[PDB]
Every structure is written in C-alpha cells, then in structure tokens.
Design a protein around this ligand. Structure first.
Ligand SMILES: C[S@@+](CC[C@H](N)C(=O)[O-])CC1O[C@@H](n2cnc3c(N)ncnc32)[C@H](O)[C@@H]1O
Ligand SMILES: C[S@@+](CC[C@H](N)C(=O)[O-])CC1O[C@@H](n2cnc3c(N)ncnc32)[C@H](O)[C@@H]1O
Lengths: 191, 191
C-alpha cells in the first residue's frame, strides 16, 4: 500500500512539481534517433514538460540510444511545419531563440532563461534553416574556443538547457509548482 | 602566400594559444563511437589539449559520429588500465573528480575548475567503476530534476566542461597562452 503510494506516487508528484511549462526546445530536422533521445533525456533533467519538433528523425519520432525511457516522461509535439510550430509557441508567450554558428549571435549565457523561452536547434549536418532564423526572435551561440566550428546538437542543447536550469534554480522557479491544477492533475494521471 | 600564413597559420596559433594543458577528462570504458567523438569535439571547444581513456570504444579509439574531425585536434592518450591513468594524472598535479549518480556527490558547480582538473566519466550502461570511485579525489554530480536517473555521458561531459569553460573565461585563463614554448611549438607543428 505505501509502496504503491509512499513511493511511486510521492516521487512522481515530487518531479511533476518541478516541471516548467514555459521552458522548451524546438528541434528542426534533427535526424539521428540518438540525438533526439539524448535531448529529451536532457529536457527531463531540467524539468521541460513538453518539447517540440518539425520533421524529427525522418518524420516520425524515433528513439533508441538514450532515454531512461525519457520519451516516457517528456511530451513531444510534432508540428506540420516551422510556421505552425512558431505560431504555437508565440501564441503561448514564448520568446524563441535560434541557435546559430554565426559570429553575430548573442552569447548564450547573456539570455535570461527564467522568462518563457523556447530554444530552436537545427539539423546535424547543416544547422538551423534560413527560414527558422527569420522567424526567431534572436540567435544565440555557445563560445567555441578550439578548431572545430560546432558542437554535437544534443551537446549544444544540454549546454544551453543546463544554463537555463542553473538560472531557474537560483531564481527559485523549481521551489514551487508551476502547472495549473488541471494540467498538473492531468500529467499526474499519465505518469 | 598570405592565404598560407595570414589564414591557416594565424587561426591555428590563435586556437593553440587558448589550449589548457591542465584541464582534461578521463573516459572509463566509454563504448560508443558517437559518445567518444562528441566528447572529443566538446574537449576541443573548451580548449582541452589532451584527453585520456581506458578501454575506449572496445579497446581502440573509434570515431564516427561527431568530430569536426575533432580527433584531428584533440590528443587522446589511452592507458593500459585505471591505475596507470591515475598515476599519470596525479604525477602531473591534477585533482581528479569522478562523476557519480550517488546522492552524496558534490554539486558539479561547486568545484573550482580553474585549478588543474581532470573529470572522470564512466560506461554508458553502468557508470564509473567502484575502482575508479576509490581512486578519485572526490565525486561530483549534475542535478537531475526529472524522472530519469542519468544523462547521456557525452551530455554530462559537456555540462561539466562548459561550466569549466565559463569559470576559466571569467578567471581570464584563455586570455594568454598557457603552454610552455616547447610544447607549444610542438603542437603548432602537427596542426
Ligand atoms: C552540427 S551543428 C550545426 C551544423 C551546421 N552544418 C553548421 O556547420 O552550421 C547542429 C546543430 O548544432 C547546434 N549548435 C552546435 N554548436 C553550437 C554552438 N556552439 N552554439 C549554439 N548552437 C550550436 C545547432 O543548434 C544545431 O542543432
Ligand atoms: C548512463 S550514465 C551512468 C549510468 C549508470 N548505469 C548508472 O545508472 O549510474 C554515463 C555516464 O553518465 C555520467 N553522468 C550521467 N549523468 C550524470 C549526472 N547527472 N551527473 C554526473 N555525471 C553524470 C557518468 O559520468 C558516466 O560516464
């Protein structure tokens, strides 16, 4: 009885209480199942409730590599195209930053991730599309101090999301629930 | 002539001038070529000169996934076993922290990465060995605020190395060269 409630029940709610409905990622054409799986695992670790994608892993979400069965816990909304994904996020109050390898992008640590924020990541071989850069509210970049031009996409997603995790921990966002009662009770129900 | 010198020559030295001889990683039994490749790409991005491993990808370093040909730039020293890798690092003044999923590990952001530091990472399916934990100077952990217990190893390596990159950028370690003349001229030679 308490194994059923004192454990599973209590730990799941504890985690649900740290879910951030206003922190997310938009994945544009991320092709490799290992990147999709690792990015969702990272989303779970920083409390992302639902992630977004356009054309993930061929068209249908496909997992394999990481995933402490992370896709079991992080919702993944797939959009028909980039404009719909942006319409969806903007209508919900998100500021959307595209990640870019351009030298004119803003340093990723200078963004305030405690505000509703969605960060867009692009295809492994060629990055965020020109279309996506045009839609975004700004472009951000992670400093590269060596010879290579870019990081693995899952890695870039983690560097940015854990800076968001750092800021929100300090700001105290994880200290109290941030899901309305209906949403909360509804996700509590699935988990 | 200037394409040969003004470009290749100048950009390579610029990067060599940011290499950190006293910041590294020790990879214990990291099996997947995509993790090894992504971790070396991350090492390049934060200025790691040489990385270390015991039993990488089956025994012989094997790359495939990431690598802006990152293995072209980051030296990888493979050791016969864990004790030799530790002897090698300790004799050189490194403090070695093991990464652990234990709840008694220190928060990774509370480590001062501006001192000579080596961070040890373990096998994808089961983590750092009990032997490695016994050898290490301390254990550190990245906060996990969701349902999953761990992050992808390459992801964990990047979260920790970019916190090191953040601290060293502030401390000004990347602002001046930190390689002795012989080492510098020698790596300059290969690149
Ligand atoms: C292989 S990279 C970009 C590749 C593209 N062929 C290029 O050379 O611009 C994949 C992706 O990496 C990202 N990304 C990689 N390194 C990054 C960095 N240093 N800062 C910000 N985003 C980064 C993008 O978001 C995108 O999802
Ligand atoms: C799949 S994980 C650990 C797996 C192991 N089966 C376990 O459950 O403890 C691979 C590895 O992840 C690391 N690692 C993963 N998440 C981490 C976190 N939150 N903090 C510190 N190290 C982490 C380790 O360094 C190691 O290289």
């Amino acid at each position: 009885m308490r194994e059923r409630t004192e454990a599973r029940r209590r730990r799941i709610e504890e985690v649900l209480r740290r879910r951030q409905p206003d922190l997310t990622v938009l994945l544009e054409n991320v092709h490799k199942p290992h990147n999709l799986s690792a990015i969702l695992r990272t989303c779970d670790a920083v409390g992302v409730l639902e992630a977004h994608a356009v054309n993930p892993t061929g068209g249908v979400p496909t997992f394999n590599e990481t995933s402490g069965g992370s896709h079991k816990w992080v919702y993944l909304r797939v959009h028909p195209d980039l404009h719909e994904a942006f319409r969806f996020l903007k209508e919900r109050g998100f500021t959307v930053y595209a990640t870019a390898l351009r030298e004119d992008a803003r340093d990723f640590r200078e963004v305030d991730y405690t505000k509703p924020t969605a960060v867009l990541f692009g295809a492994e071989k060629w990055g965020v599309s020109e279309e996506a850069l045009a839609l975004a509210d700004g472009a951000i970049k992670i400093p590269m101090l060596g010879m290579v031009q870019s990081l693995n996409v899952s890695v870039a997603a983690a560097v940015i999301l854990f800076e968001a995790q750092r800021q929100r921990l300090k700001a105290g966002l994880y200290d109290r629930p941030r899901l309305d009662p209906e949403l909360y009770q509804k996700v509590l129900a699935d988990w």
